[PDB]
Ligand binder design. Structure first.
Ligand code: KSH
Length: 271
């Protein structure tokens, strides 16, 4: 649909950017207000830093992935500077929130709760034949009621034929990315499952960096030996054994997100 017909199109005049939350190579991230009252998040593109089409590709994908557990597209402004406007999450990044005073006092119960909400979200993505590719605590957002939602769909893809394959020079965070995506550039929902495993260690260690004290090459070397991440401090053995299912050698042996959700819910109501 052209912008004069796209229901997600708004006049720039509806938006007032109030506080800049982030600034990077490709633009900024602002807290704003839509029509005076509705708090939103505004992602702006820095002209020339990258292609508008590439920039807008994220919003188009979000128009297809709507669910309570995924950050919602609020609107676009398709003339320079391009704006993407999304649901505003009051507590920000999960990796950050876990490190605040409020985050620090969270019981293992509530942590398992949040882990179940993330999985519930990825389960929806799972059924829709999508993948995320960038699943990690940095890309989970928390609300003012302490709920969690998947975010940043820049790399998310639709899987018609059951596999998406990237290019040669394409590089990804080694600690969070499954071996098959690192080695062959092949991604599936099972690749996400592996990331979800890493993400679980982020949750239980209040946002600590995975594979404590190991360089990327040490991590690859260890994984190939059959080793997995060492038991994090204060990690329920049940959770650790769940992480391990996520880290199974063969993608098809790794559990579904629906299984992961239901298991995390038993864990949560049990404590
Ligand atoms: C659309 C993608 C994106 C990126 C992003 N970013 C980008 C940089 C920092 C934050 C995630 O690390 N934040 N930060 C947010 N909230 C936020 C950020 C804070 O950081 C100053 C502090 C907060 O609590 C006072 C809340 C939100 C959001 N959608 O509400 C957000 N969204």
């Amino acid at each position: 649909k052209p912008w004069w017909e796209d229901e997600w199109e708004v006049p720039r005049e509806t938006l007032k950017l109030v506080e800049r939350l982030g600034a990077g190579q490709f633009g900024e991230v602002w807290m704003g207000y839509y029509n005076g009252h509705t708090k939103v998040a505004v992602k702006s593109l820095k002209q020339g830093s990258m292609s508008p089409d590439a920039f807008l590709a994220e919003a188009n994908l979000m128009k297809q992935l709507q669910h309570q557990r995924l950050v919602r597209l609020y609107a676009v402004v398709t003339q320079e500077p391009i704006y993407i406007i999304t649901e505003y999450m009051e507590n920000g990044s999960l990796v950050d929130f876990l490190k605040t005073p409020s985050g620090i006092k969270l019981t293992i119960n509530k942590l398992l709760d949040m882990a179940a909400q993330i999985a519930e979200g990825m389960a929806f993505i799972e059924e829709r034949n999508y993948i995320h590719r960038d699943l990690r605590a940095a890309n989970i957002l928390v609300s003012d009621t302490l709920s969690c939602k998947i975010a940043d769909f820049g790399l998310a893809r639709l899987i018609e034929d059951n596999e998406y394959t990237a290019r040669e020079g394409a590089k990804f965070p080694i600690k969070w990315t499954a071996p098959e995506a690192i080695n062959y550039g092949t991604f599936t929902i099972k690749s996400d499952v592996w990331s979800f495993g890493i993400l679980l260690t982020e949750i239980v260690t209040h946002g600590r960096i995975p594979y404590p004290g190991m360089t990327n090459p040490e991590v690859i070397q260890n994984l190939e030996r059959g080793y997995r991440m060492v038991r994090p401090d204060n990690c329920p053995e049940e959770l650790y054994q769940l992480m391990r299912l996520c880290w199974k050698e063969r993608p098809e042996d790794r559990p579904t997100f629906d299984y992961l959700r239901s298991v995390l819910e038993d864990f949560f109501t049990a404590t």
